[PDB]
Design a protein around this ligand. Structure first.
Ligand SMILES: CNC(=O)C[C@H](NC(=O)[C@@H]1C[C@@H](O)CN1C(=O)[C@@H](NC(=O)C1(F)CC1)C(C)(C)C)c1ccc(-c2scnc2C)cc1
Lengths: 104, 146, 87
């Protein structure tokens, strides 16, 4: 099965798909090709929880019901910076404006 | 031109609504005039009695948005094989983002207020141009000629 | 596998597959690897990217197509973006 994701770190968002059977490590290889950082310098998260490399995306909660093309699931990303890993930080999207009078 | 042929040859069909919309089946009569038939709630199917050479189209019953039937616009009942009814699989098209956006905005704003939206002149004309079976029949007929 | 970067007015960087970005005729004309949209905020451009994924997944498919969702609050700006992007 295909799962649809958003890999988010600070103000960067990667839109990608992967198999439910595929692993957290294979998702890191995808991030490595885009952001030029090896898997050892990356930490992936589902909410505040650090995901393990050998676990499948399905085992981490990424399924055809939660990770849809039109509503992808979020994977948090944190890079290593010198000695330590930086804290997980995801910049939110902008706030939509208030609904117009005629649209209420 | 786009009309049902009066064959009087029975054809058993299954109108299968594989979409999240309330579906309006529309039968083109022997003159080419669209004729509405009872609606189909989302995810339901109905066995209907139609005839070979009859023309059908399917719309959203409330907004008139164009839907697909067997991946195309028109469904034409055919001859059955060993008591197998013909499936008419009704699905949502992959609408353009623009058209999907026009649908949502039409569902939130009263038609008298479209011109009160803060948008380019062109987008008013797109909003005002409601989905219409008659306009679509004109488009299909022109596309069939050339 | 090629990727393209679409940057929102508020500086959010969206990295999508090149094949998916070519869904927008406007974007396809600029590429045929980094595009800046000074008028499209992130709450709209993130949805534009979801649409590219939705379009590529469900175009020429017979597996029941779900509705593409649009919150009332983003509808107007997403309509403006879609009209410019030709998608
Ligand atoms: C079971 N009864 C029928 O099918 C009956 C009915 N079926 C019809 O009315 C069919 C549909 C279309 O093929 C024309 N037609 C006819 O029966 C026509 N008759 C003929 O052409 C002849 F008899 C050969 C001379 C008629 C309109 C002129 C009466 C029907 C079809 C669909 C529904 C729908 S559409 C959505 N939900 C449902 C249930 C309901 C009734």
């Amino acid at each position: 099965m295909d799962v649809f994701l958003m890999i988010r770190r600070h103000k960067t968002t990667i839109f990608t798909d992967a198999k439910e059977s595929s692993t957290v490590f294979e998702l890191k290889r995808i991030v490595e090709g885009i952001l030029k950082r090896p898997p050892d310098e990356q930490r992936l998260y589902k909410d505040d929880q650090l995901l393990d490399d050998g676990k499948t995306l399905g085992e981490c909660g990424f399924t055809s019901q939660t990770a849809r093309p039109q509503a992808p699931a979020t994977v948090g990303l944190a890079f290593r910076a010198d000695d330590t890993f930086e804290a997980l930080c995801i910049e939110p999207f902008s706030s939509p404006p208030e609904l117009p009078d005629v649209m209420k | 031109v786009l009309r049902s042929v009066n064959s009087r040859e029975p054809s058993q069909v299954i109108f299968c609504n594989r979409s999240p919309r309330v579906v309006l089946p529309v039968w083109l009569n022997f003159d080419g005039e669209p004729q509405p038939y009872p609606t189909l709630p989302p995810g339901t199917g109905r066995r209907i009695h139609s005839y070979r050479g009859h023309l059908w189209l399917f719309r959203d019953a409330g907004t008139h948005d164009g839907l697909l039937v067997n991946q195309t616009e028109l469904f034409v009942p055919s001859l059955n094989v060993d008591g197998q009814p013909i499936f008419a699989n009704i699905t949502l098209p992959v609408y353009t983002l623009k058209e999907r956006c026009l649908q949502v905005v039409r569902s939130l704003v009263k038609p008298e207020n479209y011109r009160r939206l803060d948008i380019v002149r062109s987008l008013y004309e797109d909003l005002e141009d409601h989905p219409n079976v008659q306009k679509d029949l004109e488009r299909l007929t022109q596309e069939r000629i050339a | 596998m090629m990727y393209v970067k679409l940057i929102s007015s508020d500086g959010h960087e969206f990295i999508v597959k090149r094949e998916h970005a070519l869904t927008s005729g406007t974007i396809k004309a600029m590429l045929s690897n980094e595009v800046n949209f000074r008028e499209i905020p992130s709450h709209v451009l993130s949805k534009v990217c979801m649409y590219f994924t939705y379009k590529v997944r469900y175009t020429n498919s017979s597996t029941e197509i779900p509705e593409f969702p649009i919150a009332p609050e983003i509808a107007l700006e997403l309509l403006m973006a879609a009209n410019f992007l030709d998608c």
